């Protein structure tokens, strides 16, 4: 078949869009007349000398902005800002219309956006710089739709989603072929958790432009993850990596996470689990040979090293991530959770409970941190406190499928005795969730259910005891056999009772 | 081990929130959208020559609904004769 790569959509496009759009050499006419100069961006192009030459020759603003874009690709954000400023100082822009000055103001706006993005810090200062540049551009030329796109992006960064959505509605009124408007709308919808609504926009953008940056396939894979079709997500991410093999390590990280999830939830045997887990570790390490300080990779490796009893290195990585990415609360929550898990072996119940609470406060979506908090409450013999916390969490999250939480609730209520009905409900929910997940149902839940049903239904209790015995197999104990025999004796099953007693 | 099983169930669900770095959109990222002032319009009109057919078959497979039938005509107004 036809190879799926960047060259595929290169050949799909006409040769005008193939070579010219990716030229690393810029042709600049000279002020002397027909003389021109060609400077290759592969070589080390100096910003100051190039700007001085451009000002002397008074070249078209397109060349200035193209050089700025290339220096952006080089990462020279300061150099691109210098290019923009000296272009504003150039005679061409001063003698041109206000439209060119507005376009360069919007370019400086994009420069501020990139400066904020590349650092994820000083957000207010760069946002104010970008806002001032965008306001100047709009005042100089308000008819440019790029000013509206910049306004919408500014609203999105300040979480003014309604105004950005209105701006994208206006852009859709102007034209429905605007790819950037589609991307911004889909980003806002994903931020508003409208995964499917953003997914239609992702598909439309991908169909319109398969070579558009940012990659729509990243959002499509996120939606497939939200729609459980993670296999298609991985396939689309592989296609994106083929199209974008550079500066897209996040796709490889997502692929590694998907592989780890598949290994966890699909390995049919221990040997297959080991093979898949080691392959995922090798792929993660190969990605780490490019970047060795990525906080998410360290957090992921912390799980493996905690499973390897390397708690000291887990603490080192957690502290390093906390120092680097304290802005991200999710990393703080994960580090606190792992510190509490490490201290659990040390049984620092007060310290582990405090760490679990801090993890919950950093990121409330971390259910595991709350479950560890409840477990630590149990460790400190806080039966009532753990019960109150668990009831609060369940009543706030009645739709959450925390099977172990429901099992613990059932056990606590069985110990209480008076709340047997909630215990039955929670144990049945745990049984159903385990059956849906194809996970081994704990026979202890069956024993608790039989104990509860002793005073309600001997038939259901006996059936649950039989199910627990079938799960145990050779693990049947003396108490289970004695209770089965007593059940059959009460059922007048003399033969079966005698066999169970034997 | 109960918390380990809970982690395995959860895996890295809530850790994908930071991975949204691909959602950010910047104009300068595209190489050829800026080389001319109207390169945006040219590239928006460069893909009008392309369609779903020109998409790669594997990328077409990525277009999954969240075939024509012979008995559903498209309406007309002048007919023929």
């Amino acid at each position: 078949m036809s190879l799926l790569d960047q060259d595929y959509y290169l050949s799909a496009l006409p040769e005008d869009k193939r070579a010219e759009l990716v030229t690393l050499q810029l042709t600049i006419p000279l002020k002397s007349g027909d003389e021109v100069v060609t400077i290759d961006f592969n070589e080390d192009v100096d910003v100051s000398q190039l700007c001085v030459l451009l000002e002397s020759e008074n070249a078209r603003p397109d060349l200035w902005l193209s050089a700025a874009k290339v220096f952006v690709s080089k990462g020279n954000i300061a150099g691109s800002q210098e290019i923009i400023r000296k272009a504003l100082q150039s005679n061409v822009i001063l003698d041109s219309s206000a439209s060119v000055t507005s376009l360069f103001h919007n370019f400086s706006f994009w420069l501020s956006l990139m400066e904020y993005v590349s650092t994820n810090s000083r957000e207010d200062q760069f946002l104010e710089y970008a806002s001032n540049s965008l306001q100047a551009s709009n005042s100089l030329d308000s008819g440019l739709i790029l000013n509206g796109i910049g306004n919408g992006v500014l609203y999105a960064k300040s979480r003014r989603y309604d105004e950005a959505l209105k701006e994208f509605d206006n852009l859709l009124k102007k034209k429905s072929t605007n790819i950037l408007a589609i991307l911004g709308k889909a980003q806002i919808l994903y931020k508003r958790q409208k995964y499917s609504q953003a997914l239609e926009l992702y598909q439309k953008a991908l169909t319109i432009n398969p070579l558009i940056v940012p990659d729509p396939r990243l959002g499509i894979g996120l939606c497939f993850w939200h729609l459980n079709n993670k296999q298609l997500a991985e396939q689309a991410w592989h296609n994106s990596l083929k199209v974008h093999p550079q500066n897209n390590l996040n796709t490889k990280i997502l692929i590694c996470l998907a592989k780890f999830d598949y290994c966890f939830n699909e390995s049919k045997d221990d040997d297959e689990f080991t093979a898949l887990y080691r392959e995922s570790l090798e792929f993660l390490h190969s990605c780490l040979k490019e970047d060795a300080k990525h906080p998410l990779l360290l957090m992921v490796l912390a799980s493996y090293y905690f499973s390897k009893e390397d708690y000291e290195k887990v603490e080192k990585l957690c502290n390093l991530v906390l120092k680097e990415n304290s802005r991200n609360a999710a990393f703080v929550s994960a580090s606190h959770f792992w510190l509490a898990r490490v201290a659990y072996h040390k049984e620092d119940y007060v310290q582990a409970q405090k760490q679990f609470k801090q993890a919950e406060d950093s990121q409330n979506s971390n259910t595991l941190a709350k479950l560890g908090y409840a477990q630590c409450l149990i460790a400190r013999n806080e039966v009532g406190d753990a019960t109150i916390y668990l009831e609060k969490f369940f009543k706030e999250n009645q739709d959450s499928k925390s099977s172990e939480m429901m099992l613990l609730l059932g056990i606590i209520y069985s110990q209480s005795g008076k709340s047997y009905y909630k215990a039955i409900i929670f144990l049945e929910k745990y049984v159903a969730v385990c059956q849906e997940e194809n996970y081994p149902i704990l026979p202890e839940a069956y024993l608790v259910l039989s104990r509860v049903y002793e005073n309600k239904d001997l038939n259901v209790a006996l059936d649950y005891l039989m199910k627990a015995n079938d799960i145990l197999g050779d693990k049947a104990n003396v108490y289970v056999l004695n209770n089965l025999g007593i059940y059959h004796f009460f059922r007048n099953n003399v033969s079966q009772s005698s066999d169970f007693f034997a | 081990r109960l918390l380990s099983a809970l982690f395995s169930k959860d895996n890295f669900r809530y850790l994908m929130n930071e991975t949204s770095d691909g959602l950010d959109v910047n104009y300068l990222r595209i190489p050829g959208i800026i080389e001319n002032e109207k390169s945006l319009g040219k590239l928006f009109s460069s893909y009008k020559n392309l369609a779903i057919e020109n998409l790669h078959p594997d990328d077409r497979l990525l277009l999954v609904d969240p075939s024509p039938v012979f008995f559903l005509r498209r309406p007309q107004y002048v007919s023929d004769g």
Partner: peptide, 30 residues
């Protein structure tokens, strides 16, 4: 039988021991 075959140590809770049985050397900074 794949439904019963998949039930093994990691599902039973011996996942940590399995990871301990998998040894790998990283180029750790810390």
């Amino acid at each position: 039988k794949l439904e019963s075959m998949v039930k093994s140590n990691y599902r039973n809770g011996g996942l940590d021991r399995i990871i301990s049985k998998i040894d790998f050397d990283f180029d750790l900074e810390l």
